[PDB]
Design a protein around this ligand. Structure first.
Ligand SMILES: Cc1cc2nc3c(=O)[nH]c(=O)nc-3n(C[C@H](O)[C@H](O)[C@H](O)COP(=O)(O)OP(=O)(O)OC[C@H]3O[C@@H](n4cnc5c(N)ncnc54)[C@H](O)[C@@H]3O)c2cc1C
Length: 388
């Protein structure tokens, strides 16, 4: 799936090797966007980029710019490709060109770039690292097009879908999917070092295994002590370990299925939403004194690849005098507030209401129309109760 699979002007990279994206490809410049379909930032920025690549279809014109081709790597899947470039936070912009004497790459200082600045840059870079021909100029715009029109194929109906209704009940298969997705993808991208990260990871997984029994955390824990000097962490080995933990999610590893987190469209909600559910389920089901909020924050520190989001989250100040449950509830609501009016990159049919709504439970509100925390803390401990 990923973000650009409905857009022809952008080539989706499954691999680093450019010969196999086209014959001519290794001889042409590429502006590559690395992103994560779960990230607020990446979500929003994909607009711009699609728009930018949209301008790269011009047939016979003498713009140095028009010899470049736009491409995108999604780091929620293509973890291997991304690790190769030490990509961690996103989105991220790379200029690739042929090495004249596989490709040489150039890391963009600033990857958040307006459509023109993007153009102004790509242009500048092509001129700098290329010898700008006609023989070359037409050459690229050629394959550049065979890819465009060809990907246009891939994109009753091959479109027509239906009417959408948000599912508001909570289903384990969503919480589990979140856990699977986290271990399988997010842990994989970043690895187990340094030590502080491994620590974070162990503490989190252990806390999951204890709070949410038979979510298949046990299997994952085992995998986590398997790493040693002699058996160091590897994406291949690890992802294998996780699929065989028997985490009870729904769908295929490659494609997880959400229910409560299901959006009006595939590129909305999903993982980030499930991740929240899991975090709340943690606060409710924790054995006493594992710290939860302490642990959780520290997992988000080393495992959450959305940098805008991870940043102010690790700054929340959680005193463990009081109910983890309430506090995280507070925290998650503060976020909804922020994201409330934000139109860019959001699901049109699933708003950001302060949770729970009034229908959700009347018991939580009062005469005035504001929250009675004691009741809310009760409601959450029900809604998120984990029964196997
Ligand atoms: C820790 C964290 C920090 C994030 N920070 C940002 C950010 O800064 N910017 C950004 O764009 N995205 C951020 N995200 C992603 C974002 O929070 C949303 O999850 C996603 O962008 C859209 O969520 P949604 O509309 O599908 O429902 P979300 O609210 O995210 O999904 C949560 C689900 O859990 C329940 N829920 C909602 N609110 C509460 C609450 N108050 N208490 C208990 N349960 C609740 C509901 O069932 C809801 O459907 C963050 C995600 C996480 C996990």
């Amino acid at each position: 799936p990923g973000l650009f699979h409905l857009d022809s002007s952008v080539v989706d990279l499954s691999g680093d090797d450019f010969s196999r994206v086209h014959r001519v490809a290794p001889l042409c410049p590429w502006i590559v966007l690395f992103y994560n379909d779960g990230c607020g930032a990446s979500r929003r920025y994909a607009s711009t980029f699609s728009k930018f690549a949209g301008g790269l279809k011009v047939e016979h014109g003498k713009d140095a710019l028009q010899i470049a081709t736009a491409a995108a790597v999604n780091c929620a899947s293509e973890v291997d490709l991304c690790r190769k470039y030490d990509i961690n936070f996103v989105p991220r912009l790379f200029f690739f060109y042929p090495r004249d004497s596989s490709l040489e790459h150039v890391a963009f200082e600033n990857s958040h770039l307006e459509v023109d600045e993007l153009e102004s840059e790509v242009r500048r870079l092509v001129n700098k690292h290329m010898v700008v021909d006609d023989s070359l100029k037409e050459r690229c715009i050629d394959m550049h097009f065979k890819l465009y029109t060809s990907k246009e194929e891939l994109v009753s109906s091959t479109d027509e879908s239906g009417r959408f209704v948000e599912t508001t009940e909570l289903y384990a298969t969503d919480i589990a999917g979140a856990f699977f997705s986290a271990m399988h993808y997010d842990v994989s991208l970043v690895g187990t070092e340094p030590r502080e990260r491994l620590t974070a990871l162990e503490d989190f997984v252990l806390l999951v295994k204890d709070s949410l029994p038979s979510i298949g955390a046990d299997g994952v824990v085992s995998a986590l002590e398997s790493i040693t000097a002699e058996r160091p962490f590897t994406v291949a080995s690890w992802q294998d370990a996780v699929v065989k933990s028997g985490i009870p999610f729904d769908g295929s590893p490659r494609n997880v299925r959400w229910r409560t987190c299901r959006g009006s469209s595939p590129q909305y909600r999903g993982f980030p939403c499930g991740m929240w559910l899991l975090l709340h389920a943690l606060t409710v089901n924790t054995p006493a004194d594992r710290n939860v909020l302490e642990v959780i924050q520290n997992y988000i520190r080393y495992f959450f690849s959305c940098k805008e989001s991870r940043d102010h989250f690790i700054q929340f100040n959680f005193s463990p005098n009081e109910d983890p449950v309430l506090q995280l509830w507070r925290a998650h609501n503060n976020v909804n507030a922020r994201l409330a009016n934000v139109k860019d990159g959001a699901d049109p049919l699933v708003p950001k209401r302060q949770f729970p709504t009034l229908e959700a439970c009347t018991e939580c509100y009062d005469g005035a129309g504001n929250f009675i925390e004691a009741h809310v803390t009760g409601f959450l401990k029900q809604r998120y109760l984990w029964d196997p």
